[PDB]
């Protein structure tokens, strides 16, 4: 049973260490979701600060990888920060060598290749994280690309990750079946954020205060995260209609 400890094939052609890395991905008990506007890409994630001795401003699973690219992680924070540091290094190196900003989909592929290597080389373990990369790409427009511990990645119209990803996924599917378009037909990112929070509330069946969420927004030439007060203003607008 040593085919269970390292990344070699089991008799059914499976990689158990990879499968168990997917299971570690839900250990934080956090759900995240990403959607696309006309001009923007929004990502939201639950925020849980269960200890009063914590400084809540330091608790985060959203990362500013480059000026244009944001990353939300589903998984434990040490592996999340490992991936974040590497992604930052790769994006900076790419710009130095090739003279233009690393695209969201290309970074996703690169991090997916690195992950593939950990599934084939025995001395390296997979990282127990799922990485959702967002930007407004200069060629492709609003972009969502997500990577997992198998080294798989793909682009999304919208996506969700975490223990309750299925509820959020089906909720999002139902909306897009109705609208028949690949995005939220909205001018402002504020409204795209409100859409994103609204559909997470419906899908999880829970309400949020300003400290229960984490929000990241990608626009042309920058990615930024919202403060508690920008989020409060979002919540207020949702309640008043």
């Amino acid at each position: 049973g040593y085919d269970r400890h390292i990344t070699i094939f089991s008799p059914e052609g499976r990689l158990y260490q990879v499968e168990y890395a997917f299971k570690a991905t839900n250990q934080t008990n956090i759900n995240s979701l990403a959607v696309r506007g006309k001009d923007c890409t929004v990502v939201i994630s639950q925020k849980k600060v269960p200890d009063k001795l914590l400084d809540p401003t330091t608790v985060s699973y959203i990362f500013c990888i480059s000026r244009t690219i944001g990353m939300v992680v589903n998984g434990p924070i040490p592996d999340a920060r490992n991936a974040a540091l590497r992604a930052k290094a790769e994006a900076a190196e790419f710009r130095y060598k090739y003279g233009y900003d690393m695209p969201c989909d290309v970074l996703a592929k690169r991090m997916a290749n690195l992950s593939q290597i950990y599934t084939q080389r025995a001395y390296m373990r997979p990282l127990g994280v799922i990485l959702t990369f967002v930007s407004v790409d200069e060629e492709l427009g609003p972009s969502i690309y997500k990577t997992d511990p198998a080294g798989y990645y793909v682009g999304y119209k919208a996506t969700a990750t975490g223990p309750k990803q299925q509820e959020i996924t089906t909720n999002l599917e139902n909306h897009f079946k109705k609208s028949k378009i690949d995005h939220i037909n909205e001018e402002s990112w504020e409204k795209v954020v409100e859409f994103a929070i609204t559909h997470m509330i419906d899908a999880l069946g829970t309400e949020f205060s300003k400290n229960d969420l984490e929000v990241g927004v990608a626009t042309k030439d920058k990615f930024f995260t919202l403060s508690a007060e920008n989020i409060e203003e979002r919540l207020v607008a949702i309640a008043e209609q």
Binding site: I6, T7, I8, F9, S10, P11, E12, G13, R14, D105, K109, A112, N113, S115, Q116, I117, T119, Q120, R121, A122, Y123, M124, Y145, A150, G151, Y152, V154, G155, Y156, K157, A158, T159, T169, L172, E173, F176, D182
Partner: protein
């Protein structure tokens, strides 16, 4: 640290089996069906775009890949393993051939290089075999059109037509009935679409099928004019619309 796994992870068992290779082949068996057919004036390779979620944009996931302007590849098995092999295959076509001879490698020799990479993952220290089988279609001046299969062991074989993955045993019997040495490329495409329908459960259209051909030179895809000897790539991926047009004629 240092990689301290400098010993083989694939070894012979008392019965002469290489377990890890057999298990890699089992992973390929679970994979989505893909096939290739060789005509007199072309080759077609095809597979199903089995989308993981409908929110996924499956045109961003390319199962059929250009390796050189006259060579393409498709797989069955582990997608990530395929993606890295495509990166290595594209590179080795340059480093061990084009940068030496000033021309792209013939199909059989690029296949040979990919095969060697796959063999080494089956004997080198601290690694597992690749969990994919490849079908590689191509054209070159002196060998004409050709189609090869490569397995996790590194073994490769030339085919007139074949299938790999899930429904391969049924698909190969279907292909034996219909294949002859007088097929024109359009006939082979038609047969590929018929064969592939059998192994597909749900939606069957241009958006769920990925199909590419090796055929005539495409001067319209070259990107420049003025060099007579340069006439364009023979590899071409069919559009969603082009597939649907041929699905009415089905």
């Amino acid at each position: 640290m240092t990689d301290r796994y400098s010993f083989s992870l694939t070894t012979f068992s008392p019965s002469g089996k290489l377990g890890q290779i057999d298990y890699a082949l089992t992973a390929v068996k679970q994979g989505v069906t893909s096939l290739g057919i060789k005509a007199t004036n072309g080759v077609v390779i095809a597979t199903e775009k089995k989308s993981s979620s409908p929110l996924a944009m499956s045109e961003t996931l390319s199962k059929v890949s250009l390796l050189t302007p006259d060579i393409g590849a498709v797989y069955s098995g582990m997608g990530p393993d395929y993606r890295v092999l495509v990166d290595k295959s594209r590179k080795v076509a340059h480093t061990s051939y084009k940068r030496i001879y000033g021309e792209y490698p013939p199909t059989k020799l690029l296949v040979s290089e990919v095969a060697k990479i796959m063999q080494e993952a089956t004997q080198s220290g601290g690694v597992r075999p690749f969990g994919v089988s490849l079908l590689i279609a191509g054209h070159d001046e002196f060998n004409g059109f050709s189609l090869y299969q490569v397995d996790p062991s590194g073994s490769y074989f030339p085919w007139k037509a074949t299938a790999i993955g899930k429904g391969s045993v049924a698909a190969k019997t279907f292909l034996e009935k219909r294949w002859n040495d007088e097929l024109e490329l359009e006939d082979a495409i038609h047969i590929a679409l018929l064969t592939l329908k059998e192994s597909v459960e749900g939606e069957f259209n241009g958006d769920t099928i990925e199909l590419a051909i090796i055929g005539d030179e495409n001067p319209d895809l070259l990107g420049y004019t003025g060099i007579p000897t340069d006439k364009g790539p023979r590899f071409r991926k069919l559009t969603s619309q082009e597939i649907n047009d041929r699905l009415e004629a089905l």
